[PDB]
């Protein structure tokens, strides 16, 4: 909701973003699929 | 519904029990859903370090010869769920400036899954700052914004 210019953001306004549905970039996607496989 | 640009790119790595290199984020979004991709970090590998860092820097010790390291401890799942997000929050979110005046040099962040006895779900969460000088804004900044929840622990040690 709120673009400061200098990319300095309030804590509320960053910390709310932890439920994006947004994908991780593919190498983190790929990495993190397979190290919870070799777990369970 | 547009993304929330990093003030700096950060590259991805995960370092097991050197690193594998995996990739950049460069907005709140990638680096939210490299957390959750990860999650529960308290069920990670035990000791295997989850690495961000600003711009690429390599992250080892001998690059930050006069730095320090703010670390916070939680014990409980609860704990991390409020600790991670606000390290997040304070380092590429950069509300660290509003203390540091300028640049913070939180240039580094390492998260690790530390079993103990008493809590399995421990996990340390380290800052590198590669100037000493603000350390003391930086620990007293932490330890205020983790003081609603007294399990949180917060320490500052040399590199």
């Known amino acids: 909701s709120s673009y400061p210019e200098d990319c300095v953001y309030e804590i509320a306004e960053f910390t709310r973003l932890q439920n994006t549905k ?17 777990s369970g | 519904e547009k993304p929330h640009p990093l003030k700096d790119r950060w590259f991805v790595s995960y370092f097991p029990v050197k690193g594998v290199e995996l990739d950049w984020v460069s ?3 990638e680096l939210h859903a490299t957390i959750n991709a990860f999650s529960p970090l308290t069920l ?3 000791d295997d370090n989850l690495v961000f860092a600003r711009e690429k820097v390599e992250p080892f010790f001998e690059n930050f010869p006069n730095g320090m ?5 939680t014990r409980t799942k609860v704990q991390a769920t409020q600790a ?3 390290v997040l929050a304070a380092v590429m979110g950069e ?6 005046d300028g640049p913070s040099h939180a240039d580094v962040v390492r998260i690790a899954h530390k079993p103990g006895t008493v809590y399995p779900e ?8 590669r100037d000493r000088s603000k350390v003391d804004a930086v620990t007293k900044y ?4 983790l003081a609603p929840h007294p399990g949180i622990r917060v320490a500052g040690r040399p590199i």
């Open chain 1, 22 to 38: 947004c994908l991780p970039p593919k190498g983190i996607l790929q990495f993190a699929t397979d190290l919870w496989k070799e």
């Open chain 2, 27 to 29: 907005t709140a979004e």
């Open chain 2, 44 to 46: 990670l590998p035990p």
């Open chain 2, 69 to 73: 390291r703010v670390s916070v401890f």
């Open chain 2, 84 to 86: 991670v997000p606000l």
């Open chain 2, 95 to 100: 509300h660290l400036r509003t203390v540091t």
């Open chain 2, 122 to 129: 421990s996990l340390r969460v380290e800052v590198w700052l």
């Open chain 2, 142 to 145: 932490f330890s205020e914004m």
